[PDB]
Backbone:
RNA sequence: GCUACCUAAGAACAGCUAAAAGAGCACACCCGUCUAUGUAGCAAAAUAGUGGGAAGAUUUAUAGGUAGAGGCGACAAACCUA
RNA sequence: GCCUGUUUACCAAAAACAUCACCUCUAGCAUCACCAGUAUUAGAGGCACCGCCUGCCCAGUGACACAUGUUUAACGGCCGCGGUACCCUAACCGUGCAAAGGUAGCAUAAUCACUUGUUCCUUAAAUAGGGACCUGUAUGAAUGGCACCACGAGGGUUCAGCUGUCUCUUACUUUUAACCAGUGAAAUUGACCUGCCCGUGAAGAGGCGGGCAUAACACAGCAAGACGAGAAGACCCUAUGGAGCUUUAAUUUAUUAAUGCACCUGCAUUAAAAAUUUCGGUUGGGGCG
RNA sequence: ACCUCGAUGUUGGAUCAGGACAUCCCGAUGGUGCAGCCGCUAUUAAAGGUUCGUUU
């Protein structure tokens, strides 16, 4: 740990493919079949960047927030997470975990009276509550369909689940979720943003895996773990990957893990005499494997919002 | 007499790494992933390269068996003389 | 998707089918499959190796009720210190002192008498109970979901190299080519002495109208037109034209399987297997009359 | 529902582009709330030109 991040004109990365451009006009074509809107985010990013569009555009149905990924999260400061959301205007938040289905039972109260607290306009006679989940990629929207299908319908899996952003393609059909009070979920492709706030807020959202690692950079994401595992005093990468004691240079930490994993690469280096090939430790493969252990949870439960928690 | 499966009694499977592996590399063999040529063609489905398997749920010679309201089928509602 | 395998000979090799393992169903048995077998077997299937946990459709009173824990109980070694002994070897006395203790009530698995159920009489409404008696009151289950260790001519993504893929093509060689010689097809083809522009027209003209152009013929290229050639468009519709398949469509039960007034045979009932025949007209995309 | 169901093949792309001008640039002018620079608009002009990538 030396100081903060020298971004030095890093510039925001931007990924807006045909998923979110086409999805938005198929999401906005279907607000007559929606009784509630579910916001699903990472618990690593509750406050800093949620979404530019989704907050103020969608106001007709009331909001409920589902901050998923609570197993890789420390909630000693749960009291003030509510504080920044209460001051925003966001009232109810349900933190969920989706391997033991922890606190996933508790939402099934908290949707039923919420539609009852408000008006329904057209669907005054319908007993079937068709509700919609929307959000940025890779946060827990498709697993929320399958966890809620598991513990209430006791039926099974209805949506493809496996960790890489963008392998669900478009707006699919309805999915039965429960028999006790009836409720249908609509699955959406993850609309992230046309523009992503600032540069620092861009990397906080890019770190959880919601964007491909190519447009941002594997070693660019690699140094930002060293910002958040050394300045937070959460030195939790030194019992799995303990190199000598602890380091803050991205050059040194990608060195020693490549020895421990046995990584080799053959790179055309460009010296002044000509093009020669030198065998090097595989710095992208070291930047890959250092990022996967972060997402598995074998590096420590971290908050990414300590920079905005200061004050 | 093709083909699908079966019966009878037969045959084939180098070298290499490993040891009793429906193991790995790889011939002979079997199959046909991709490309190109070919499209009245060499061929009513082939050639050249690249590929999958190649001691096994393998491949194959010979003789027999099941026949159409049927046979046979590791279901492609495939195959039963184009 | 577990894997090796398997499949549409001739447009699909796959994520499909198969696969151990697991689960459900049927069968207590001989001489022609199963099988010269016998429930750890055989058949019919489902799912896909192994791995992980979710509680249960015995209705009552009251008592049985476990360590673990709680209901709650005494005394002394090494050594330290103050003294009395005294060349010394070092002693003696008076003390301080850790752990060590597990009677025994009690939420609390062990298993059962009791309006409690059967049956039968009064009302001839159930007056609302009298009885007669007693039901070893059969082990209290057993099904869904998750899950990457390898593997893959599977579907995506990526690091690095690499190379005419590309920027931007070039050179050469062979085949082809063109020409000379020999042999010699095929689709195609109303007749054509077969131009361009604008207009026209069955709505896109070589042929019609008004202009324009125009000696005649070979050879090599080109692919804009001849709605170019090949195959009575696979999409849409029609036919009281077919066929495959499925049923809770109609008509049937001869046929097999059961019983009826040992098998056979003759008439009935309930099923299984099927057989035969059709699927009006008017809006078809409807946001589902 | 007019031509074609005795076959008029389906978007973009590659290649080659022919044309219109209702002009995006270059050229020539009128007006400006046109100081200069940038512009805005109109007239005139089709000779020439109109890039390379990321994303299924
Ligand atoms: P990649 O090379 O990006 O894929 C190319 C795509 O071509 C498609 N396509 C061919 N012909 C089409 C057509 O007549 N009409 C459409 N709408 N698309 C056509 C196309 O879609 C089928 C391809 O990409 P994908 O299949 O991956 O889907 C993206 C596709 O979605 C459409 N879209 C995106 C965003 C938005 O705001 N509106 C849209 O309509 C685009 O067509 C886009 O290509
Ligand atoms: N180590 C670990 N992994 C988890 C945990 N929970 C979820 N995962 C992982 O994340 C899951 C993937 O989530 P998924 O909904 O498929 O994300 P996605 O990549 O955006 C897929 P799609 O594009 O279809 O929406 C699984 O791959 C895997 O179980 C956890 O508690 N621990
Ligand atoms: N560690 C952990 N991760 C979880 C848990 N639950 C959900 N996740 C994660 O949530 C992520 C999935 O988000 P996802 O539902 O796929 O977002 P999406 O919008 O559908 C992606 P797309 O853009 O394609 O639409 C995954 O990285 C992973 O499953 C959990 O209990 N633990
Ligand atoms: N429209 C449509 N949806 C399907 C089809 N198959 C699956 N789905 C959707 O995917 C969901 C999950 O199906 P799985 O077979 O469990 C279904 O509930 C339905 O929403 C299909 O053939 N058509
Ligand atoms: N797996 C699967 N997905 C389908 C199928 N048909 C449609 N889909 C899903 O629905 C999408 C198209 O939805 P709509 O036709 O807009 C597809 O891109 C795919 O995600 C199908 O047959 N199989
Ligand atoms: N019917 C049908 N066949 C297809 C389609 N796409 C591919 N195929 C078949 O698969 C073959 C191989 O295609 P792969 O995508 O390489 C094709 O030659 C064709 O036979 C499709 O959309 N429809
Ligand atoms: N016209 C046309 N040509 C096509 C189509 N699909 C492929 N092509 C190819 O493009 C070429 C260009 O022909 P023109 O479009 O007539 C054709 O010769 C053919 O090879 C299509 O749908 N229409
Ligand atoms: N119009 C058109 N779209 C095409 C064509 N080939 C592919 N596509 C588009 O690409 C998509 C992907 O199909 P692939 O050919 O598997 C199609 O669904 C279609 O949208 C083509 O020849 N014409
Ligand atoms: N009127 C006209 N505008 C043109 C012409 N050529 C180019 N343009 C203009 O230039 C633009 C170029 O577009 P880019 O390729 O994005 C066109 O959209 C059009 O506005 C032309 O011949 N006439
Ligand atoms: N017309 C005009 N503009 C000037 C002159 N000097 C400076 N400027 C303006 O000042 C600008 C640069 O000066 P400053 O350093 O910003 C120029 O681009 C121009 O706009 C001058 O003499 N005449
Ligand atoms: N080559 C190229 N890059 C572009 C284009 N548009 C955007 N980009 C890239 O995306 C970046 C972000 O552009 P946004 O318009 O802010 C650009 O700085 C450039 O790198 C384009 O038309 N061509
Ligand atoms: N339209 C389709 N899209 C995707 N898979 C298909 C498909 N039609 C067939 N298949 C695949 O082929 C398998 C076998 O189908 P077949 O028509 O019996 C299916 O189980 C499925 O895996
Ligand atoms: N001096 C030179 N150097 C390189 N290439 C040359 C050359 N002289 C001729 N060429 C080649 O010859 C081509 C032109 O000759 P020819 O017409 O093909 C060029 O495009 C180039 O590829
Ligand atoms: N230096 C060069 N490199 C490559 N090709 C060449 C060349 N000089 C000549 N040529 C080839 O020879 C042809 C005739 O050229 P010459 O000088 O007339 C060229 O068109 C090209 O194909
Ligand atoms: N312009 C032309 N016209 C006619 N025949 C030609 C021709 N050019 C070549 N040929 C033919 O090709 C033959 C070989 O020609 P190349 O130039 O060698 C000639 O003798 C002649 O038969
Ligand atoms: N007018 C025409 N006459 C003859 N053959 C033609 C033709 N137009 C096209 N073709 C044939 O079809 C091929 C592809 O052309 P596309 O469909 O335009 C051509 O290379 C040619 O073989
Ligand atoms: N909705 C439907 N209407 C008519 N026939 C149907 C049908 N669904 C299925 N079938 C018939 O039953 C067969 C088996 O279908 P099942 O869904 O497995 C089909 O091949 C078809 O012949
Ligand atoms: N409309 C229909 N007409 C006839 N048979 C049908 C049918 N719909 C379904 N079936 C039959 O029922 C089976 C299962 O369909 P069910 O709706 O789950 C099909 O495979 C087919 O045999
Ligand atoms: N090479 C070129 N040839 C022709 N017009 C061009 C061009 N480059 C640009 N342009 C035109 O000029 C306009 C202004 O470009 P400038 O660099 O601001 C562009 O929007 C385009 O219309
Ligand atoms: N080829 C071209 N033809 C016409 N105008 C051009 C041109 N290239 C450039 N220009 C003009 O010059 C301006 C700047 O040129 P570039 O930055 O060199 C463009 O905005 C455009 O107006
Ligand atoms: N470098 C360039 N050269 C030529 N045309 C360009 C260009 N950059 C942009 N254009 C074209 O100019 C038009 C608009 O750009 P302009 O500078 O506002 C578009 O048609 C665009 O494709
Ligand atoms: N020297 C010139 C300039 C313009 N003009 C006329 O000016 C107009 C077009 O301007 P040019 O493109 O500059 C036309 O009317 C043209 O006849 C001319 O006749 N002689
Ligand atoms: N340095 C200068 C000189 C003149 N100009 C312009 O030229 C006009 C005439 O200037 P002369 O010095 O007279 C000025 O009114 C101004 O519009 C300018 O912009 N900058
Ligand atoms: O019988 C057939 C039909 C198509 N084909 C060809 O197979 C190809 C099918 O398309 P795919 O996408 O490769 C296409 O080239 C067809 O002309 C055959 O070779 N045989
Ligand atoms: O060759 C093709 C393929 C698709 N398509 C169009 O694309 C649509 C989707 O086809 P894809 O291949 O999924 C199809 O319905 C057509 O409209 C074509 O027009 N031509
Ligand atoms: O010598 C020249 C002439 C013109 N050009 C380009 O052509 C454009 C048009 O010029 P003209 O002469 O109208 C000019 O603006 C330049 O972009 C050159 O690059 N060089
Ligand atoms: Mg099938
Ligand atoms: Mg009639
Ligand atoms: Mg009608
Ligand atoms: Mg037609
Ligand atoms: Mg014709």
Residues:
């Amino acid at each position: 740990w030396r100081e903060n991040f020298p971004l030095c004109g890093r510039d925001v990365a931007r990924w807006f493919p045909g998923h979110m451009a086409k999805g938005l006009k198929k999401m906005q074509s279907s607000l007559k079949l929606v009784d509630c809107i579910i916001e699903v985010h990472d618990a690593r990013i509750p406050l800093s960047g949620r979404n530019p569009l989704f907050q103020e555009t969608l106001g007709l149905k009331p909001h409920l927030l589902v901050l998923n990924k609570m197993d890789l999260a420390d909630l000693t400061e749960q009291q003030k997470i509510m504080q920044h959301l209460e001051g925003e205007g966001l009232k109810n938040v349900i933190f969920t975990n989706c391997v033991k289905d922890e606190n996933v039972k508790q939402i099934i109260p908290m949707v039923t009276e919420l539609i009852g607290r408000s008006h329904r306009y057209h669907r005054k006679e319908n007993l079937e509550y068709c509700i919609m989940v929307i959000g940025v990629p890779n946060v827990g929207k498709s697993s929320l369909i399958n966890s809620l299908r598991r513990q209430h319908l006791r039926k099974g899996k209805a949506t493809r689940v496996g960790g890489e952003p963008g392998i669900t393609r478009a707006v699919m059909s309805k999915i039965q979720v429960s028999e006790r009070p009836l409720m249908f979920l609509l699955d959406t492709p993850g609309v992230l943003a046309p523009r992503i706030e600032s540069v620092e807020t861009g990397l906080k959202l890019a770190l959880c895996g919601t964007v491909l690692d190519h447009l941002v950079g594997e070693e660019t994401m690699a140094d930002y773990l060293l910002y958040t595992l050394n300045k937070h005093q959460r030195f939790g990468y030194v019992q799995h990957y303990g190199l000598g004691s602890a380091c803050d240079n991205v050059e040194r930490v990608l060195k020693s893990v490549a020895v421990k994993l046995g990584k080799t690469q053959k790179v055309k280096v460009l010296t002044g005499t000509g093009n020669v090939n030198i065998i090097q430790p595989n710095y992208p493969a070291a930047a890959r494997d250092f990022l996967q252990t972060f997402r598995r949870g074998l590096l420590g439960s971290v908050m990414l919002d300590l920079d905005v928690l200061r004050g």
Remarks:
- Residues 99, 150, 154-157, 164, 166-167, 212-214, 218, 265-268, 277, 282-285, 287-288 of chain A lie near RNA strand C (CB under 10 Å from a C1').
